Design a protein around this ligand. Structure first.
Ligand SMILES: CC(=O)N[C@@H]1[C@@H](O)[C@H](O)[C@@H](CO)O[C@H]1O
Ligand SMILES: *[C@@H]1O[C@H](CO)[C@@H](O)[C@H](O)[C@H]1NC(C)=O
Lengths: 44, 50
């Protein structure tokens, strides 16, 4: 399980900015499990 | 080849850098996280002027 991430500073209001920003890998986990469905998590 | 200090930049935990001919050009030392560029030691033809 590989995770890629990059945190870029944008001042746009509501749209994905036009530009290029590659995402360096963050962490790899050799879990070897089955993932077919997923859900996010939010705070209140 | 020969090992030398490298002015290259890597990822936080990147490993090495390959080149066009599928030959490794640089390598990161496994013991201490230091990057070395691999340059093959000198070679070439020999011509005898006589
Ligand atoms: C690689 C594989 O076989 N994955 C199976 C899929 O074939 C099957 O349809 C599903 C539930 O039926 O469970 C999973
Ligand atoms: C392995 O070597 C590095 C540097 O040579 C050292 O910092 C590290 O502690 C060593 N590993 C262990 C388990 O001692």
């Amino acid at each position: 399980f590989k995770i890629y991430s990059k945190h870029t500073p944008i001042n746009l209001v509501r749209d994905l900015p036009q530009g290029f920003s590659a995402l360096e890998p963050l962490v790899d986990l050799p879990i070897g499990i089955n993932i077919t469905r997923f859900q996010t998590l939010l705070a209140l | 080849g020969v090992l030398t200090e490298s002015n290259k930049k890597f990822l936080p935990f990147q490993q090495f850098g390959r080149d066009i001919a599928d030959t490794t050009d640089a390598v990161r030392d496994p013991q201490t996280l230091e990057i070395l560029d691999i340059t093959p030691c000198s070679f070439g033809g020999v011509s005898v002027i006589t």
